[PDB]
Amino acid sequence: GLSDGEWQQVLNVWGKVEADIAGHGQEVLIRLFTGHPETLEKFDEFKHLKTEAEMKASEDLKEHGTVVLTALGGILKKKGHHEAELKPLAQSHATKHKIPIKYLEFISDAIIHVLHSKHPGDFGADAQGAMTKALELFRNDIAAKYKELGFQG
Ligand code: HEM
Numbered sequence: 280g281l282s283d284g285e286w287q288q289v290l291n292v293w294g295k296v297e298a299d300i301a302g303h304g305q306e307v308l309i310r311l312f313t314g315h316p317e318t319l320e321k322f323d324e325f326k327h328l329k330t331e332a333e334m335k336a337s338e339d340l341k342e343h344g345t346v347v348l349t350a351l352g353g354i355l356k357k358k359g360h361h362e363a364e365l366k367p368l369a370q371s372h373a374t375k376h377k378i379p380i381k382y383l384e385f386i387s388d389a390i391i392h393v394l395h396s397k398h399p400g401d402f403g404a405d406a407q408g409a410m411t412k413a414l415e416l417f418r419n420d421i422a423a424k425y426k427e428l429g430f431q432g
Contacts, residue, residue: 304344369424379432
């Protein structure tokens with residue numbers, strides 16, 4: 280867990296994202312897909328967008344980025360009391376999309392990268408500490424449900 284002070288740093292940084300969720304969303308997906316090409320293959324509707332420039336030219340990709348960060352923001356705002364929002368996501372990523380936990384690790388690092396990239400010098404050490412914790416929490420709770428389901432990957 281996170282202290283209230285850590286949660287207040289998480290939500291304060293999330294406010295920066297909300298200034299433009301789609302722009303942040305697109306950056307996260309691109310970092311993921313260029314950094315770990317294997318992840319693109321799980322998306323049937325984007326697997327043909329193998330380079331950064333192709334990825335940038337798709338509003339469909341950008342609306343998916345929007346969906347991803349609006350879901351995440353909604354989870355962060357629960358401050359760890361997220362059992363109800365997390366179970367459906369774990370189940371669908373495990374059973375429908377077949378997303379190994381490693382990919383969640385990847386997107387987690389991608390978010391940190393993007394925050395530093397879009398707000399250089401504005402994402403403090405303290406802020407980073409708290410955001411990291413928050414994503415680890417998220418990952419760890421998804422991990423528990425994967426285990427329940429035996430999604431070996
Ligand atoms: C911050 C972590 C993530 C969040 C919040 C998230 C959220 C979502 C949401 C809300 C949906 C739509 C509803 C559903 O199908 O459950 C979805 C679908 C999907 N997710 Fe994720 N996701 C995350 C990570 C990932 C990663 C790392 C991958 C793959 C490398 C992935 C692959 C997919 C795919 C393939 C679908 C179906 C897509 C489509 O129909 O275009 N997700 N995700």
